[PDB]
Enzyme design. Structure first.
Site, short mmCIF file in Angstrom:
data_model
loop_
_atom_site.label_atom_id
_atom_site.label_comp_id
_atom_site.label_asym_id
_atom_site.label_seq_id
_atom_site.Cartn_x
_atom_site.Cartn_y
_atom_site.Cartn_z
N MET A 83 -11.88 21.71 -27.18
CA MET A 83 -12.08 20.86 -28.35
C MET A 83 -13.05 19.72 -28.07
SD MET A 83 -11.60 20.12 -31.53
CE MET A 83 -10.40 21.39 -32.01
N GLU A 87 10.04 12.92 -15.90
CA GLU A 87 10.71 12.29 -17.04
C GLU A 87 9.97 12.52 -18.34
OE1 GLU A 87 10.54 10.96 -14.00
OE2 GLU A 87 11.92 9.27 -13.78
N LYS A 120 23.42 -2.28 -15.73
CA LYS A 120 24.31 -1.54 -14.83
C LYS A 120 25.71 -2.14 -14.73
CE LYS A 120 24.06 0.21 -10.02
NZ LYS A 120 23.21 0.22 -8.79
N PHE A 122 13.75 -5.93 -8.05
CA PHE A 122 13.36 -4.58 -7.67
C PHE A 122 13.51 -3.62 -8.86
CE2 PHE A 122 14.73 -0.59 -5.23
CZ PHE A 122 13.41 -0.16 -5.06
N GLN A 123 12.42 -2.95 -9.22
CA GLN A 123 12.34 -2.03 -10.37
C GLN A 123 12.66 -2.65 -11.75
OE1 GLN A 123 14.62 1.55 -8.44
NE2 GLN A 123 12.50 2.08 -8.35
C1 LIG Z 1 13.88 1.74 -1.56
C2 LIG Z 1 13.10 0.53 -1.07
C3 LIG Z 1 13.70 -0.34 -0.14
C4 LIG Z 1 13.01 -1.44 0.38
N1 LIG Z 1 13.64 -2.13 1.38
C5 LIG Z 1 12.92 -3.07 2.02
C6 LIG Z 1 13.43 -3.78 3.24
O1 LIG Z 1 14.51 -3.61 3.77
N2 LIG Z 1 12.55 -4.69 3.76
C7 LIG Z 1 11.33 -4.99 3.28
O2 LIG Z 1 10.60 -5.79 3.84
N3 LIG Z 1 10.92 -4.34 2.13
C8 LIG Z 1 11.62 -3.41 1.49
N4 LIG Z 1 11.03 -2.87 0.35
C9 LIG Z 1 9.87 -3.49 -0.35
C10 LIG Z 1 10.28 -4.55 -1.39
O3 LIG Z 1 10.35 -3.97 -2.69
C11 LIG Z 1 9.32 -5.78 -1.40
O4 LIG Z 1 7.96 -5.40 -1.58
C12 LIG Z 1 9.40 -6.62 -0.10
O5 LIG Z 1 10.76 -6.88 0.26
C13 LIG Z 1 8.65 -7.97 -0.25
O6 LIG Z 1 7.25 -7.73 -0.50
P1 LIG Z 1 6.25 -8.97 -0.13
O7 LIG Z 1 6.94 -10.32 -0.30
O8 LIG Z 1 5.83 -8.84 1.32
O9 LIG Z 1 4.99 -8.69 -1.08
P2 LIG Z 1 5.09 -9.09 -2.61
O10 LIG Z 1 5.47 -10.51 -2.92
O11 LIG Z 1 5.91 -8.12 -3.46
O12 LIG Z 1 3.52 -8.91 -3.06
C14 LIG Z 1 2.44 -9.65 -2.46
C15 LIG Z 1 2.68 -11.18 -2.29
O13 LIG Z 1 1.41 -11.76 -1.90
C16 LIG Z 1 1.25 -13.06 -2.48
N5 LIG Z 1 -0.17 -13.35 -2.52
C17 LIG Z 1 -1.19 -12.54 -3.02
N6 LIG Z 1 -2.42 -13.06 -2.82
C18 LIG Z 1 -2.12 -14.21 -2.14
C19 LIG Z 1 -2.99 -15.17 -1.64
N7 LIG Z 1 -4.32 -15.10 -1.75
N8 LIG Z 1 -2.57 -16.24 -0.98
C20 LIG Z 1 -1.23 -16.33 -0.83
N9 LIG Z 1 -0.32 -15.45 -1.27
C21 LIG Z 1 -0.80 -14.41 -1.94
C22 LIG Z 1 1.88 -12.88 -3.86
O14 LIG Z 1 2.29 -14.10 -4.47
C23 LIG Z 1 3.06 -11.95 -3.59
O15 LIG Z 1 4.25 -12.70 -3.32
C24 LIG Z 1 11.72 -1.74 -0.10
C25 LIG Z 1 11.11 -0.86 -1.03
C26 LIG Z 1 11.78 0.28 -1.50
C27 LIG Z 1 11.06 1.21 -2.45
C1 LIG Z 2 -3.74 12.68 -23.35
C2 LIG Z 2 -4.92 13.09 -24.18
N1 LIG Z 2 -6.10 13.10 -23.57
C3 LIG Z 2 -7.14 13.54 -24.28
C4 LIG Z 2 -7.00 13.98 -25.58
C5 LIG Z 2 -8.18 14.56 -26.34
N2 LIG Z 2 -8.19 16.03 -26.35
C6 LIG Z 2 -7.76 16.70 -27.47
S1 LIG Z 2 -7.79 18.43 -27.19
C7 LIG Z 2 -8.42 18.14 -25.57
C8 LIG Z 2 -8.66 19.27 -24.58
C9 LIG Z 2 -9.05 20.61 -25.23
O1 LIG Z 2 -9.00 21.63 -24.24
P1 LIG Z 2 -7.60 22.41 -24.04
O2 LIG Z 2 -6.42 21.49 -24.25
O3 LIG Z 2 -7.48 23.00 -22.66
O4 LIG Z 2 -7.57 23.56 -25.11
P2 LIG Z 2 -8.87 24.18 -25.76
O5 LIG Z 2 -9.62 23.19 -26.60
O6 LIG Z 2 -9.77 24.89 -24.76
O7 LIG Z 2 -8.33 25.23 -26.71
C10 LIG Z 2 -8.59 16.80 -25.26
C11 LIG Z 2 -9.11 16.29 -23.93
C12 LIG Z 2 -5.72 13.89 -26.11
N3 LIG Z 2 -5.42 14.32 -27.34
N4 LIG Z 2 -4.68 13.47 -25.44
C1 LIG Z 3 10.22 7.66 -11.51
C2 LIG Z 3 11.46 7.52 -10.67
N1 LIG Z 3 12.47 8.36 -10.92
C3 LIG Z 3 13.55 8.27 -10.14
C4 LIG Z 3 13.60 7.38 -9.09
C5 LIG Z 3 14.80 7.32 -8.16
N2 LIG Z 3 14.52 7.87 -6.83
C6 LIG Z 3 14.16 7.03 -5.80
S1 LIG Z 3 13.62 7.96 -4.44
C7 LIG Z 3 14.16 9.42 -5.23
C8 LIG Z 3 14.17 10.79 -4.57
C9 LIG Z 3 13.43 10.85 -3.23
O1 LIG Z 3 13.39 12.20 -2.83
P1 LIG Z 3 11.98 12.75 -2.31
O2 LIG Z 3 10.87 12.41 -3.26
O3 LIG Z 3 12.05 14.25 -2.15
O4 LIG Z 3 11.79 12.03 -0.93
P2 LIG Z 3 12.90 12.18 0.16
O5 LIG Z 3 14.08 11.32 -0.18
O6 LIG Z 3 13.30 13.61 0.53
O7 LIG Z 3 12.30 11.59 1.42
C10 LIG Z 3 14.57 9.23 -6.54
C11 LIG Z 3 15.06 10.35 -7.43
C12 LIG Z 3 12.49 6.57 -8.94
N3 LIG Z 3 12.37 5.74 -7.91
N4 LIG Z 3 11.43 6.61 -9.70
#
Ligand SMILES: Cc1cc2nc3c(=O)[nH]c(=O)nc-3n(C[C@H](O)[C@H](O)[C@H](O)COP(=O)(O)OP(=O)(O)OC[C@H]3O[C@@H](n4cnc5c(N)ncnc54)[C@H](O)[C@@H]3O)c2cc1C
Ligand SMILES: Cc1ncc(C[n+]2csc(CCOP(=O)(O)OP(=O)(O)O)c2C)c(N)n1
Ligand SMILES: Cc1ncc(C[n+]2csc(CCOP(=O)(O)OP(=O)(O)O)c2C)c(N)n1
Ligand SMILES: Cc1cc2nc3c(=O)[nH]c(=O)nc-3n(C[C@H](O)[C@H](O)[C@H](O)COP(=O)(O)OP(=O)(O)OC[C@H]3O[C@@H](n4cnc5c(N)ncnc54)[C@H](O)[C@@H]3O)c2cc1C
Ligand SMILES: CC(C)[C@H](N)C(=O)O
Ligand SMILES: CC(C)[C@H](N)C(=O)O
Ligand SMILES: CC(C)[C@H](N)C(=O)O
Ligand SMILES: CC(C)[C@H](N)C(=O)O
Ligand SMILES: [Mg+2]
Ligand SMILES: [Mg+2]
Lengths: 159, 159, 541, 531, 159, 159
Positions: free
Chosen positions: C470, C58, C170, C120-121
């Site tokens: 640089m 992106e 959405k 979520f997201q």
């Molecule tokens: C495409 C996709 C689909 C998904 N589908 C599913 C699905 O079907 N099923 C599924 O299970 N998940 C799924 N997930 C994951 C989902 O996003 C959530 O993370 C999940 O449903 C719930 O997470 P959680 O409650 O276990 O942890 P989360 O709540 O997200 O994170 C950690 C939890 O720990 C608690 N916590 C931290 N420290 C402590 C502490 N010391 N004492 C007590 N509590 C504490 C926090 O309050 C928090 O609630 C999916 C993910 C993706 C990417």
């Molecule tokens: C995301 C980010 N990280 C670091 C910098 C600082 N910075 C400016 S130029 C540079 C690197 C210089 O090397 P290169 O880009 O490979 O070209 P060169 O100087 O050899 O011509 C860095 C780390 C920046 N501008 N942006």
């Molecule tokens: C940064 C970002 N862009 C787009 C998405 C939407 N998205 C969720 S999974 C996925 C594609 C997954 O394909 P791949 O990484 O090849 O794994 P595969 O499904 O083949 O197992 C996309 C585009 C996202 N989650 N995050």
């Protein structure tokens, strides 16, 4: 030359307007002493108080004009103006203390809002100089709570 | 929806108002009035605000606000018994003849005059929203120039 | 406009938005699919006029939309899904707001009822971006979409250009509604502040001031006034100094073009400023790389910001130059302007301090003089942020504006390869050449696959040296040559990675070059080959 | 602690900060050089105990610090230069705040006198991140650095863990000052709200049930409780590893991509013990124990709820049950009916490799003991369902954010945190190429990371929403060249001098997976699959 | 220049005021107002005055005044915090109809009426120079006959 | 949902009219908490206060319209309205008690009607909320007698 300037801002309403206005001072690390605003109809008028230099003010008073939904901005602080604050206070008031504090409210032209045997609520309004005098007087009494609006202001119309 | 009042105490760090107003704006709620000022002790400020919401949603929002590091405490006041006041300045374009009429209304409302020009006059008023809107609705026939409302300020009464 | 739906047919908000874009003259958008953008992507497939280009990352998408907007002057557009998509855009928006480039970003959002739940997201992208954009909107009603989109394009283009963002839930994208293409803009504050046309009394006072040692100082504000400035130079013969953003606005090959000024600027241009008597700060913001007075600007905030001017005018430099050109034309014989003494003295400085730079171990400045020569100074050039950006800015003779595309105030690394994609889409038949250091390059190397998908004719010039050049310079200059890990090869050995294999992975022809005498033919071989190519240029660190 | 400077010697603020980190037990930091971080990088080179790891792109840095923090439980650290560097971190912080992972980010800032003007590379990073971090600080005085750093580590680790950020102006980093390692924390609101120990009267009140556990259970007591009860356990995509997947009562993942029997269990349960969960919609489409008072009643109103660390609640209930186990005589032999459902709907899938078989083979060839990291794709659901984790922290994945590109750097973080573990990265086609440039770093550190790529030439998971809902319409989900594997990832490995192989046959794959496990050091396996 | 206020104590001998006014007139300084009267004890009078000057020149003038035999002490009050009051009588030519209008202004200023004829009326006012000039500027439409302003009187406040 | 509703009834006069009105509530076993009326000329306006459900009110407020000599009937309770009560009280007042009770009457804007060394009569008027506050204050004093009118009401004229 740290000074306690005051700015007034006039706006069209949107959700998050106070958050845009509060962001320009937070981005400096500048401190808002007080701010008061009430949505009048479609539009609102801020008055705000801040501590700093007249130099950096010209930046933040310019950068506020970049916002698309600000209508007008002024530094009001140097101009001839009406200026007032509302303060409200709750104080413990034993029957004897009730006797002297009566003499005080009877002086400041203050009003009493409600009564209980443990405490009273008083409404106070005027110029900020009277407000500080009042605070220095109440210092000798057992305050329970206080709240205040911050100075509202408007320019006087010279002919 | 219905309107609610929140009273908040905050740790008074520079920029903290941006953190708090961000929580309301992230729920999208449009704050209708806000006042912020020094509380009863050095190093704390009070914020007071009016919002259109549900008494379900405010309960979620006060739970949400407790996640902030810099709040000390938060209260809804809406279902409690509380005293309330509000301050207003108003400016009016008026000629010598109408000046009579306006002074009459002022006397009825117990409004205090506070600026005069033969072009325009300004009045101070204190009270509550119904007298505020009533007055602002009654003075419509004249060229009302601006209105610097504070927003409400409130305290619970223990009685 | 021709509508795909009846003027009274209720349709999905998505199609309302797509139509609003077509109505605005949109032609190509950079977008990435994901669970919150499917509706928009589908509508973009139902549309026929707007082309869709899918990059690999992106943060490549936003840099392509920026290259496109910079080279064509048209407002660039990019779209992305909520959460991790949206957040990856931040590095782009922070650039656009620093270079005053018009851009519009659109993103999908969680259903309204889910906002603030941490669903979520879900991400408060509006609150994250609020401080780095000219304005941003949360769409709470499909009915405002036409007005919002219009206001957005206007804000992006009107005044000082800048990026803007619109977020759409959405469910609002799916909701069916009847459009209304007739509605007024609600911009009372902004509109009331829009700059009025310049006042001739000041133009004539400027003509009066027009001095014994004058210098013209122009920057990015002059992008739309190259002809008027050239004409003014005829009516005056004043030497012109240009910023790293002003390049191309004035022909580099003209006798009066002093090239870049400042910290890296030419020594003669810096002497000119040091000894000038009248500074015409037209379209500049007094950046510290330049500063370490007559000010004309559209942005009333820049007036007096860094240095107090003696005279200042608020308004479009274009109109100010047309007005002054007429005022000068009707009085040129009366004014009898002459600065030959100053012009000669400065030419003497040119002669005393001309631009200058170990066997076959290539001078990269020679590699760039060759690149200018073999391209008539006419190509589109794009650059990263290292030493290589300074060389490509100094040693190439830009003849037109927009020929130079580079990150000015932000200096974002990885800008090159996607900005070359933007310029290549905007200028189908132009020669596009991208010049990079290997640190600036590798951060976005995943975009090379996109070139093969579009078969674009992009030419890549990697100035390889196995260091962050640089950074490695300011160590050797000041911090006693001591190393914050500024080497990017394998200490055990050779070029790492073998970028030839990276080209091979994409089926793209490539070459490596190491010696001064081959280089001139190697550059010509890259220029002569049809379609895309890569040249890897090996240099001493 | 042993100081490199005299207790009264004035020294640069940079060294003050470095010492403050060493005092906190810091061992390795992910950082990237640049004009606002040179002071810090030079101090990190003067230090001897803290190792520095330089990734190729800053988003790789933040993901490596997250992999390290998730696998070790220690607070992760990452440092970057102002402007473009800082902004690249945003995709990381938004993940940490969603998974409750402790992390501390430090960044360099423009000189104080330059703030607000839009100087070169200036950015309101504090204002940009304010809404997506647990707290953040602008350092206005070198003298507060010790207190700020301390408060930060405390906030990151105390309560619900979360990310925190500290920004330091360059001139303050250079300024010479005398430290003071003795100062109190100024957290009067937060401290007053810290959860008090659980109350036994509720534990005793707690004494067709189903145990529902998530990420809150990361920190033996649950296994013991299962002995004292014999209740079947359902786990979330984050709860995986907290309970052995091979136990008779482990119902595996529940919910929308969960096991059918676990879903039936919830559908027919009579008592839900929501311990360490937040009722996420992927699960929900009641007894609640949580440290976060905000989650109590957030999504669904519980019948009973307790605020406090689940660890102490389980120790208390374990004692209450132990002294009365014979009196309670708990029995749910419900367990059989659900086992019948297991029997009626067990998990399942020519030479065109099943990805589930690739995971089944890898589990059995590694005792279910290896550390797994994923992208976000179809491959994330398969590697969650089909691999039998036996410890917590064996599973590293983006829970709530769903951030693509997470895989490879999270494998780096885990490899630095567990020098001798078997680290395998299981990745999407889309998810891999987004950060393929980090492969160079593996060669610099010679880490033995094993890369398994579920190549099907598409953005895969989005193509399931196409083929299920949007009538199989292609919205460009195909990533290959229509005229004809693209890119040839074998050449990508070759560019790094890393051995690799491509595989297509079910009959070859078991030997190929073992070949990668046999081969010392890093390796790449490209598993060609049907889309 | 800017205005300054001097408070002086003097021996109250016959003709001493001529000596003091000679010192100001020998510098040429035009005194804007002056009021003299008995102090807190028998045998002393207080003089209070206003002059346009520099805060440099008043420092020279108070040093110069100490050379007089008949002064006891002299103070500038201008940079100090001090209370201030002033009295005014005003006469106006007014007819029965305008009398209404004038009484309105009087009521606003809290002016007290003190003489009446159907030819003319006179009002008494007390306050400070801004209300004084404001009133005198507002009554211009009517035949203002004379004004008998006292000049200011001031005392420092120790608070 | 027991609530303390209020009804207003407008009548043409006949001997025994109050007896018909009081019969409709007596027939239910309802309770008239207060009632006030005065014959204005040829017609009269009741205001009455009762306790019960809004359900049974619809019956008795309908049954009141069946009377041949009722002109108009309204439930006033929900509308925006002016509302007042008069109260009169006689209280024992020892010379010391005379001192504090003076402070109270001086607060509530109360008047004293007559004096005797043993007791005083006070007239009190306002909104019912002030009336209850007063009663809770008088609780601490030796009341001798009290009487009150029951609340009079009228609708406010919105435009
Ligand atoms: C495409 C996709 C689909 C998904 N589908 C599913 C699905 O079907 N099923 C599924 O299970 N998940 C799924 N997930 C994951 C989902 O996003 C959530 O993370 C999940 O449903 C719930 O997470 P959680 O409650 O276990 O942890 P989360 O709540 O997200 O994170 C950690 C939890 O720990 C608690 N916590 C931290 N420290 C402590 C502490 N010391 N004492 C007590 N509590 C504490 C926090 O309050 C928090 O609630 C999916 C993910 C993706 C990417
Ligand atoms: C995301 C980010 N990280 C670091 C910098 C600082 N910075 C400016 S130029 C540079 C690197 C210089 O090397 P290169 O880009 O490979 O070209 P060169 O100087 O050899 O011509 C860095 C780390 C920046 N501008 N942006
Ligand atoms: C940064 C970002 N862009 C787009 C998405 C939407 N998205 C969720 S999974 C996925 C594609 C997954 O394909 P791949 O990484 O090849 O794994 P595969 O499904 O083949 O197992 C996309 C585009 C996202 N989650 N995050
Ligand atoms: C490592 C590095 C070193 C650098 N060193 C140098 C150096 O030595 N020399 C150098 O020149 N640069 C250097 N730069 C770039 C420099 O720091 C600034 O980023 C650059 O000057 C910004 O462009 P600008 O000043 O022209 O104004 P911009 O940032 O491009 O802003 C555009 C200006 O045009 C005005 N404008 C827009 N429309 C109009 C209109 N219609 N009419 C009038 N005005 C208008 C705007 O209000 C604004 O003032 C360097 C960059 C890097 C990365
Ligand atoms: C005008 C202001 C109070 C605005 N309604 C806000 O919510 O920010
Ligand atoms: C309390 C608040 C207004 C605080 N002083 C701020 O600057 O954010
Ligand atoms: C004090 C002064 C006025 C004095 N009584 C005099 O006659 O001069
Ligand atoms: C109207 C009423 C008071 C009537 N005169 C009666 O006797 O009942
Ligand atoms: Mg380089
Ligand atoms: Mg895929």
């Amino acid at each position: 030359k740290v000074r306690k300037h005051t700015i007034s801002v006039f706006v069209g309403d949107e959700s998050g307007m106070i958050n845009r206005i509060a962001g320009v001072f937070a981005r400096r690390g500048y401190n808002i002493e007080s701010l008061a605003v009430g949505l009048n109809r479609d539009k609102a008028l801020f008055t705000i108080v801040v501590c700093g230099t007249e130099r950096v003010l010209q930046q933040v008073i310019e950068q506020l004009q970049k916002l698309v939904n600000v209508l007008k901005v002024e530094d009001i602080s140097s101009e001839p103006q009406v200026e007032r604050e509302l303060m409200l206070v709750k104080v413990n008031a034993h029957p004897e203390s009730r006797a002297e504090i009566m003499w005080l409210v009877d002086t400041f032209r203050a009003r009493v809002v409600d009564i209980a045997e443990h405490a009273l609520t008083i409404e106070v309004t005027g110029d900020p100089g009277k407000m500080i005098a009042v605070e220095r007087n109440l210092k000798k009494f057992q305050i329970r709570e206080i709240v205040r609006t911050g100075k509202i202001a408007l320019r006087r119309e010279k002919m | 929806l219905r309107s609610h009042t929140l009273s908040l105490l905050v740790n008074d760090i520079p920029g903290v108002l941006n953190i708090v107003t961000g929580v309301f704006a992230r729920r999208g709620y449009n704050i209708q009035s806000l006042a912020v000022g020094h509380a009863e002790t050095k190093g704390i400020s009070r914020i007071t605000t009016v919002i259109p919401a549900t008494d379900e949603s405010v309960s979620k929002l006060v739970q949400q606000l407790y996640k902030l590091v810099d709040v000390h405490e938060v209260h809804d006041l809406t279902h409690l018994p509380f005293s309330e006041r509000e301050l207003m300045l108003i400016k009016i374009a008026v000629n010598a003849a109408a000046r009579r009429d306006v002074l009459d209304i002022a006397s009825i409302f117990r409004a205090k005059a506070v600026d005069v020009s033969d072009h325009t006059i300004t009045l101070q008023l204190t009270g509550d929203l119904d007298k505020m809107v009533a007055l602002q609705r009654l003075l419509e026939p004249y060229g009302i120039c601006e209105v610097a409302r504070t927003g409400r300020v409130a305290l619970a009464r223990e009685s | 406009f021709i509508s795909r739906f009846a003027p009274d047919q209720p349709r999905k908000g998505a199609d309302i938005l797509v139509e609003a874009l077509e109505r605005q003259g949109v032609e190509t958008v950079f977008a990435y699919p994901g669970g919150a953008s499917m509706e928009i992507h589908q509508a973009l497939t139902r549309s026929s006029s707007i082309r869709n280009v899918l990059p690999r990352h992106e943060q490549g998408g936003v840099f392509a939309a920026e290259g496109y907007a910079r080279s064509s002057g048209k407002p660039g557009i990019c779209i992305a899904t909520s959460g991790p998509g949206a957040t990856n855009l931040v590095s782009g928006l922070a650039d656009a707001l620093l270079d005053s480039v018009p851009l519009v970003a659109i993103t999908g959002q969680v259903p309204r009822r889910m906002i603030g739940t941490d669903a979520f997201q879900e991400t408060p992208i509006v609150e994250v971006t609020r401080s780095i954009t000219k304005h941003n909107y949360l769409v709470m009603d499909v009915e405002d979409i036409p007005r919002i989109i219009e206001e957005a394009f206007f804000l992006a283009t009107s005044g000082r250009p800048g990026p803007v963002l619109v977020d759409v839930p959405k469910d609002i994208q799916q909701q069916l509604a009847i459009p209304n293409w007739e509605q007024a803009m609600r911009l009372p504050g902004y509109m009331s502040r829009m700059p009025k046309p310049p006042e001739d009394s000041h133009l004539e006072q400027i003509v009066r001031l027009i001095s014994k040692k004058p210098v013209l100082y122009v920057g990015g504000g002059c992008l739309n006034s190259s002809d008027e400035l050239g004409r003014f130079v005829e009516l005056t013969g004043i030497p012109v100094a240009s910023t790293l953003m002003g390049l191309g606005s004035y022909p580099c090959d003209d006798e009066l073009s002093l090239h870049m000024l400042g910290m890296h600027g030419t020594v003669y241009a810096n002497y000119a400023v040091e000894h000038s008597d009248l500074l015409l700060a037209f379209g500049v913001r007094f950046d510290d790389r330049v500063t370490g007075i007559v000010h004309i600007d559209i942005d009333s905030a820049e007036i007096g910001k860094n240095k107090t001017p003696h005279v200042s005018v608020c308004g479009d430099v274009k109109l100010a130059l047309q007005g002054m050109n007429k005022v000068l034309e009707n009085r040129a014989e009366e004014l009898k302007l002459d600065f030959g003494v100053w012009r000669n003295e400065l030419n003497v400085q040119k002669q005393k301090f001309p631009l200058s730079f170990f066997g076959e171990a290539i001078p990269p400045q020679y590699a760039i003089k060759v690149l200018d020569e073999l391209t008539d100074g006419k190509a589109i050039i794009s650059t990263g942020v290292g030493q290589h950006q300074m060389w490509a800015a100094q040693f190439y003779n830009y003849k037109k504006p927009r020929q130079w595309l580079s990150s000015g105030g932000l200096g974002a690394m990885g800008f090159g390869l996607p900005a070359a994609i933007g310029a290549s889409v905007a200028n189908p038949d132009a020669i596009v050449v991208d010049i990079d250091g290997d640190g600036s390059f590798i951060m976005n190397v995943q975009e090379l696959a996109t070139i093969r998908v579009e078969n674009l004719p992009v030419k890549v010039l990697l100035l390889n040296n196995q260091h962050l050049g640089m950074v490695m310079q300011w160590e050797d200059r000041f911090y006693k040559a001591n190393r914050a890990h500024t080497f990017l090869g394998d200490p055990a050995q050779e070029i790492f990675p073998n970028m030839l294999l990276f080209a091979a992975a994409c089926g793209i022809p490539a070459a490596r070059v190491t010696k001064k005498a081959d280089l001139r033919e190697a550059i010509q071989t890259m220029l002569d080959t049809p379609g895309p190519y890569l040249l890897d240029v090996i240099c001493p660190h």
